[PDB]
């Protein structure tokens, strides 16, 4: 998959979501797609603009990936 190796910078997302995600120091896309929706909602300020862009880019949270990160 040519997207797991690309960092978070390729989302063109909102400033609120961009600020919220990097508070936990996320650098790649794979760890976003690793965590499920039931823990990322504890961060203040987000629940209404990730699913649409993920579907537009053909990705979804909750799936499992082994050997991650592959370094």
């Amino acid at each position: 998959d040519p997207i797991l190796l690309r960092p978070v910078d390729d989302l063109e997302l909102t400033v609120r979501s961009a600020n919220c995600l990097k508070a936990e120091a996320i650098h790649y896309i794979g760890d976003l797609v690793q965590r499920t929706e039931v823990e990322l909602l504890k961060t203040p300020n987000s629940l209404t603009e990730i699913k649409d862009v993920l579907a537009s880019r053909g990705l979804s949270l909750g799936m499992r990936l082994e050997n991650w990160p592959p370094a």
């Binding site: 960092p7 390729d10 990097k22």
Partner: protein, 108 residues
């Protein structure tokens, strides 16, 4: 005496050391000789002319600015504001600017 120094080359001398302390700090071989030839180029480059040198940290802002964007980690907006004595507007501006900068780097 000051007017005598007005056209004095003392400024030339003052500079070889300005070059020295960075070259010695960066640890290159042979400070003095490198810096004098280094000055001679400026002399020929800038002989007998009015020149505005960017004054009063203006360059140092750009380097102060780069480090701050590196240490901006998303929720410490107060932390780097004390430690640079800057203000909320300054922080926001530098943040957005360097964000666009890196986005041009990651994106083609």
């Amino acid at each position: 005496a000051p007017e005598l120094e007005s056209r004095w080359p003392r400024s030339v001398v003052d500079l070889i050391d300005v070059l020295e302390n960075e070259l010695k700090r960066q640890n290159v071989s042979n400070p003095r000789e490198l810096a004098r030839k280094q000055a001679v180029a400026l002399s020929c480059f800038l002989g007998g002319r009015q020149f505005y040198i960017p004054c009063g940290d203006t360059i140092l802002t750009a380097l102060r600015d780069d480090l701050l964007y590196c240490q901006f980690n998303g929720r410490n907006m107060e932390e780097l504001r004390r430690q640079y004595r800057l203000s909320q507007p300054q922080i926001y501006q530098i943040i957005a600017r360097q964000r666009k900068l890196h986005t041009r780097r990651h994106q083609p």
